[PDB]
Amino acid sequence: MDVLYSLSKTLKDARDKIVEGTLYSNVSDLIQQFNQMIITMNGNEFQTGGIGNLPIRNWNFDFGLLGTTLLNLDANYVETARNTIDYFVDFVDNVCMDEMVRESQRNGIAPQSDSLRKLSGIKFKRINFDNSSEYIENWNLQNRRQRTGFTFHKPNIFPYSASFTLNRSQPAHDNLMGTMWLNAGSEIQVAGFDYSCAINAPANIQQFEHIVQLRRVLTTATITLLPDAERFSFPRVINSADGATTWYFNPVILRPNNVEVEFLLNGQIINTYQARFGTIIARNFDTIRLSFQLMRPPNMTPAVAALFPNAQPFEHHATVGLTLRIESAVCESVLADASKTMLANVTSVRQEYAIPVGPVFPPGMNWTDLITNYSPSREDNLQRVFTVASIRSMLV
Amino acid sequence: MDVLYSLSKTLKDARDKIVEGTLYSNVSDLIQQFNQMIITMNGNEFQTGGIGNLPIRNWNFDFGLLGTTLLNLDANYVETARNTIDYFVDFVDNVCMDEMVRESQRNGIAPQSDSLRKLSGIKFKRINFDNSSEYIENWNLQNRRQRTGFTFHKPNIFPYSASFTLNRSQPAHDNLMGTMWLNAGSEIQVAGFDYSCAINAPANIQQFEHIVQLRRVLTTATITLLPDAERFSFPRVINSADGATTWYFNPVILRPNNVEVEFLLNGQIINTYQARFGTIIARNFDTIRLSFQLMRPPNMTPAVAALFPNAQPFEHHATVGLTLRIESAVCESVLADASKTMLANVTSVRQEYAIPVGPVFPPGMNWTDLITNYSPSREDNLQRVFTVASIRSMLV
Amino acid sequence: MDVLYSLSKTLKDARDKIVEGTLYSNVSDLIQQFNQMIITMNGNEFQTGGIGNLPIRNWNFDFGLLGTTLLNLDANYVETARNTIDYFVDFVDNVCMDEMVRESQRNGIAPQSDSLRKLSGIKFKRINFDNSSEYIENWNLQNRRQRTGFTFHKPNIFPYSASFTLNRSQPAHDNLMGTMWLNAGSEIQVAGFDYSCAINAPANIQQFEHIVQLRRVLTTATITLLPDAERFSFPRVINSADGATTWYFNPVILRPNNVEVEFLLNGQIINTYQARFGTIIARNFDTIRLSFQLMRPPNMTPAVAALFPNAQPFEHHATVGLTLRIESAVCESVLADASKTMLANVTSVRQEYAIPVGPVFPPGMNWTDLITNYSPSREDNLQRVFTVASIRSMLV
Amino acid sequence: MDVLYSLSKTLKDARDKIVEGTLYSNVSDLIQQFNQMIITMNGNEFQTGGIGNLPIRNWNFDFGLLGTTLLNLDANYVETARNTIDYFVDFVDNVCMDEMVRESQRNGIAPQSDSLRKLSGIKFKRINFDNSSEYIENWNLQNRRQRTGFTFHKPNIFPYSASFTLNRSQPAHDNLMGTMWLNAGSEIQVAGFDYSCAINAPANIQQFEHIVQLRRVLTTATITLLPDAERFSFPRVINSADGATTWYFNPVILRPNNVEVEFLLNGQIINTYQARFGTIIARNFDTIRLSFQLMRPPNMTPAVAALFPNAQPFEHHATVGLTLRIESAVCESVLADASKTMLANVTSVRQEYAIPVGPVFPPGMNWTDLITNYSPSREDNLQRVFTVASIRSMLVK
Amino acid sequence: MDVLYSLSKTLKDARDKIVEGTLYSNVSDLIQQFNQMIITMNGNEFQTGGIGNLPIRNWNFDFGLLGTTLLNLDANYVETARNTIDYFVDFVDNVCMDEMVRESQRNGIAPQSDSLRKLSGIKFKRINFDNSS
Amino acid sequence: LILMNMEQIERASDKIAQGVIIAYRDMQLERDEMYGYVNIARNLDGFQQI
Ligand SMILES: [Cl-]
Ligand SMILES: [Zn+2]
Ligand SMILES: [Zn+2]
Ligand SMILES: [Zn+2]
Ligand SMILES: [Zn+2]
Ligand SMILES: [Zn+2]
């Protein structure tokens, strides 16, 4: 992996630095690294495999070294470099694609394609040099059982789930008490609805609780908390849990009462926020517990008192919302996020070449299914393919 | 462009690395590059800025070389370097501004300002060195006609458009079937509304379709797909198509049925997602075809059954929604997005100096009008000014 | 700060570059810098402080130099380097943590911890080398009295605020004219609501104005302007200004009229956008003025004509909304944003070690209170701790 | 800036010291400085002035050095020196005027005129010598970001504001309770007026409060506090807040009660003065809170008792004043003040040559507009033009 | 007092006149005065403070003399001088603050702070020069 | 290589010392395995350097 990354990094440096007219002193170290790569690869035969529809490709390396006896690079030098660079970039792209489409339950962290296993041989370790990318840095750290860290803008940590729980229900579905939520990506919208507006609740308070368990621990997370949930504040006709019949929802939004956001690690409260909404920090957590109360307002104007009678029928249902958006976080595991392209690149390569479903990943690399059941083997295979995808995205 | 970028990059390196106390070995290659730049620029006269309120600036270069003999840099060395760097940074900023405010219909990719034309001469190609930025790398690749790639977070590919189509309507606007949508920036919110709730539709199904034709092909795109269009889920009084009258829309949201999101390239299905929500990947497409359905609930509770009568008047209008957000994508063409500042830089420079409207760009660099009619000449001019703005933001 | 950053950058480079098999020429400059660091640190005792629960730690430096005479680095070389690197990383992390948890009112930009004050001595200036990160570059430019700016994706410039102004009201809260708004982070959602729908207004137009005074000037700001406010588009039961009673809000959304968004600096209009939605560019401003009008629709279909009677009771309240999202901007000062972890890192370190409240920051480093009262002393302390947090992030 | 200041300083020293009959030992160092200036400037072309009506002036330097063999200065020596000095003073005047009429949004502290930009080059740094003026000293401290200090006699820290607040009012405007204030320059005159004289107040006390927020922090401020406000102590006919009608103010002055001056920094109490009048010291503050009570006097002689009835109509309205004068203060930013001429010089040059409105300063250098919105970019540009104005004043004035 | 004033005036002249690029002849007399101050102050221990909340501060002088150049001062010279100048300015400010907060019914004109009392010793009279304010 | 090892090579010489501290206070002679009692300074901490 570090050798594949080193090939890609050398090729990117050569593309950026070996330009017409440039001082040779600008490229001397890059030229030495490039010539070392050429010497190491020369004489080695590689086969990028024919899994799925990915075509079998054979790679042969007999390339001359780049010259070292110029003061400024000229057009001849750039063209000589660029032919070799093109061949090497093609080879690295095909190796990366071959690795991305492969998985195993046993050693998913280990290389799977024949070319990458060959590149793991000691006779290629000379190619290895500056491992500065976040993905390769974390790869090296995890190879050594060291504390890893990935920074994610809007991490896709929540599997998509648009669900509801009814804590008070009946066949008519007209005096309902419960919660509905969309947990998607980095966003949790939750809303507790009481159709009776807690007329008969003790103290005229209805308590709603929403616990979301993250499949990995998040650290140093900046989160936006907002009082209302705009996704559950308009009238809807919602199917019943069995799907037999459809019930009606006609929310009127009250501000939530005694909002308590707990961020918990192993069930221990690490962070606690009470009645604070703007922008909060959860330093280390794997569970979010949102407690929020519908409080029937003690004093009402006549219209509000009209909305909420003493008994059924209830036509205006008192809903209290909550929005939780993880803007940025740090995770010890790879994750999809709104800014990167590793998941998209891996999925695109697997789709374009009709890679059959394997033992490890769900079909189509579906992220909801993947992150719902983020097993250790899935984590190893995902980190491997994501590191390979980043290596590929350095050149492609 | 490569020379302007090399000047800017050399100056940024000099600002960051020529610091008091630093080992000369940290700067040796940079000092060589800087001295080469000084030698090349010495004895050359430049003029920048004669368009709009951009002032006329004359530039003369007669500077001494930086020393090579120190072991660690001291205050004298840093001061001499800083004076030269200040002059050069001012010159580069003015050249970038002079290029950013000019456009051409014929050869808009080629340099427009006199200074960049002078810098395109062979006698300046020695300045050229490491071209590592994504924008200059794409510029060089586009020069050789290699496949370019710009990564965007929340690409602004959709021109702003809030419109609606009525497939069934009458002058009183009380039995309406149709679609309303907002295509803005990176988001598509589309809602199909039937006022009869598909009482008389065949099989009690109303089909809604929405086609968005992207002006450029997108690859490796990460898409959030959510069932509901919250933007079209509240009571609304809407102007009629000719604006002669207003009509009422009292939505009640049902979940969409048989959701099929197709991503098409050249009218062929590249990606297709059937009832899939959360994160999906569109590997290569220029069109998005969202087809959904309002399916009248076969079973209703008394409240739901009351919402939807057998005939007019229809007071609750059955609406199905869809929200599609492009988080990240790759495009072969420059585009505005949420994280970069190229468009903002170019617009700000053109507004500060009162640049008259030109034959290429719309007035004020209006992005909606620009991406609506994204012609090849507009694309070439925009890539030029965006590359210049990225070069400028390295220093300014 | 420059010295602490240089230490961290040296260690990060050593971790990324001192890898088995690599050519010594790839790392030669780094090895020279590393040996310079060792020479400058050898023989010095440091104490990282006991503030809060952060333990007192003593640091000693008697390390040997790394070798320079191999053609390729080997496993022995990597192990020897790693031993020294681990100690230096621990020391730098502790210095960063000690500096992050301290504040001063008189001179908040100057170092606060004893270790960082010792490292500002001239005897350590030899460690200083490439200052290339955005935060350290801004730090140096600001020490040089040079114009520098931080780039923010979704800057958290707006203190959280959900409030309303009632320009027409009565104790029964049934003929209300006013504005509702949420300013949160980088987002503004405003809505003018008239219960009489401007039945008895001059020209049947109701004017709404909303001014947001930014605590710092923003430049080259990309902004999305959308013509509705989904946060204030559904029925709500809202406390009164004193909380004595609760009133009822029953929006029906009309298109806002004469929408004029002004971006102002020093009370002067810099940018003006009339009836423009989608992407706009605010080049330089400290205030946002949003003017909009609820225009009574001159023609109404019977369904619409019913909703707005000539007199009370008013059941459907005509609301017109605007939404303003700052996607990207540039600020002279430091700010929290959706991408960067500086605030989260500082808050996490302050929470983990039970750092008491100081005379500068609000308790818990709460961002709303901080940005509300962004004083110069707060700004200085906050830039200091944010730069230190970034330096720590390079290694931790 | 340091080079322009050094040029002007050398020229002023030459004008003051190169005088007939003086010992050469009185001027040897000055002669060396003057000759270094001549050597550095020789062979350099400068252009000043292409904005507004400021003419384009071209400057060429080919001068001989002043001699060094004399033991006493004679008339011919002084005349040749004066010729060179006059040319240099004309040049420095023009460079200063060219710099003063320019502004920048980005780097307002940096030079804007081309001549000062050229003078910023390394070759000219040899001219630099004693930087002892307060403005150039503050300039050098600010370049290194050391704590600056500007001493202002009567700082112009308050924008002009003459307004009133009504806490109790009604359309007839005959039972009014409120405050009126003039904040102008270095002065705050405030007055709380109750028309009923706190007859029906809770214990016959009417509390008045006035908050003034300074746009810059002041330190080491000598402040006079006088109990009365002569500005709001005579009959007035005042517009209404909407301007629809006019109300009447017939004040009768009572001594203010429980007078409390508070000087605060970042919303924290720094100085508190209770019942203290005359000279007080506010060591470091950005806000002034004046709180003062109208106390209805329990015992009244018959004329006083006739002034204030039990109920309306109220003809004589009980008013309590306060006058606050900042005599001298220190500010870390430049400011207009009563003794200096920097603002007046900058404005005079800008008006004399019809300098168009720029993107930084108000439409004509109005101090009220500037101080009301004293932004950092404005502060940088103002400090630059004020330092240039002082450099010019060393020679032109 | 004369000595404290002379230290402060020497420091002010050093700040104003020891500037990058200036002729050494502009500063020669000032450099001699400054080096004489360094010689007189070196090896002497001073204590300031210990009244109210004024902190106790200890001052030690172990500085080198300012060098000489052929023609003009350079940036290195200015930074080296500014280190010493900054320490001395800190010391003088602290001595002045220590004296300003003290008073005496008897001999109120005489120095009251320990540092100024030490500075009134004969050894420091060498520092004394132009008393022009 | 020479520049990084210069100090070590110079300090290995038996005929040059790296300096001398004149401290007019009475300092105990150090006990060093190479000398017995020796007025050897390990460093220069606490003294002005000429
Ligand atoms: Cl985002
Ligand atoms: Zn149910
Ligand atoms: Zn984002
Ligand atoms: Zn219609
Ligand atoms: Zn109210
Ligand atoms: Zn009135």
PDB file of C-alpha atoms in Angstrom, chain C residues 145, chain D residues 1-2 108-111 133-145 148 150 379-388:
ATOM      1  CA  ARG C 145       0.961  44.345  10.145  1.00  0.00           C
TER       2      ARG C 145
ATOM      3  CA  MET D   1       6.926  56.234   6.061  1.00  0.00           C
ATOM      4  CA  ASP D   2      10.127  56.124   8.106  1.00  0.00           C
ATOM      5  CA  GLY D 108      -4.578  51.136   4.101  1.00  0.00           C
ATOM      6  CA  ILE D 109      -1.546  51.209   6.383  1.00  0.00           C
ATOM      7  CA  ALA D 110       0.751  50.572   3.396  1.00  0.00           C
ATOM      8  CA  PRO D 111       1.875  53.373   1.059  1.00  0.00           C
ATOM      9  CA  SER D 133       8.137  62.395  16.833  1.00  0.00           C
ATOM     10  CA  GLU D 134       5.152  60.957  18.647  1.00  0.00           C
ATOM     11  CA  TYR D 135       3.389  59.953  15.429  1.00  0.00           C
ATOM     12  CA  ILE D 136       6.365  58.245  13.773  1.00  0.00           C
ATOM     13  CA  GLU D 137       7.250  56.631  17.102  1.00  0.00           C
ATOM     14  CA  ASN D 138       3.721  55.238  17.373  1.00  0.00           C
ATOM     15  CA  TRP D 139       4.013  54.180  13.732  1.00  0.00           C
ATOM     16  CA  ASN D 140       7.161  52.151  14.393  1.00  0.00           C
ATOM     17  CA  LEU D 141       5.633  50.615  17.522  1.00  0.00           C
ATOM     18  CA  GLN D 142       2.488  49.679  15.579  1.00  0.00           C
ATOM     19  CA  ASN D 143       4.546  48.095  12.787  1.00  0.00           C
ATOM     20  CA  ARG D 144       6.020  45.719  15.373  1.00  0.00           C
ATOM     21  CA  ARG D 145       2.615  45.518  17.095  1.00  0.00           C
ATOM     22  CA  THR D 148       0.839  52.274  20.993  1.00  0.00           C
ATOM     23  CA  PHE D 150      -1.592  58.724  21.449  1.00  0.00           C
ATOM     24  CA  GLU D 379      -8.202  53.190  11.364  1.00  0.00           C
ATOM     25  CA  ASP D 380      -5.272  51.987   9.248  1.00  0.00           C
ATOM     26  CA  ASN D 381      -5.887  54.546   6.508  1.00  0.00           C
ATOM     27  CA  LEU D 382      -6.402  57.318   9.059  1.00  0.00           C
ATOM     28  CA  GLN D 383      -3.216  56.492  10.949  1.00  0.00           C
ATOM     29  CA  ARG D 384      -1.328  56.508   7.657  1.00  0.00           C
ATOM     30  CA  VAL D 385      -2.686  59.861   6.480  1.00  0.00           C
ATOM     31  CA  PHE D 386      -2.268  61.399   9.950  1.00  0.00           C
ATOM     32  CA  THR D 387       1.371  60.306  10.183  1.00  0.00           C
ATOM     33  CA  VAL D 388       1.902  61.762   6.710  1.00  0.00           C
TER      34      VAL D 388
END
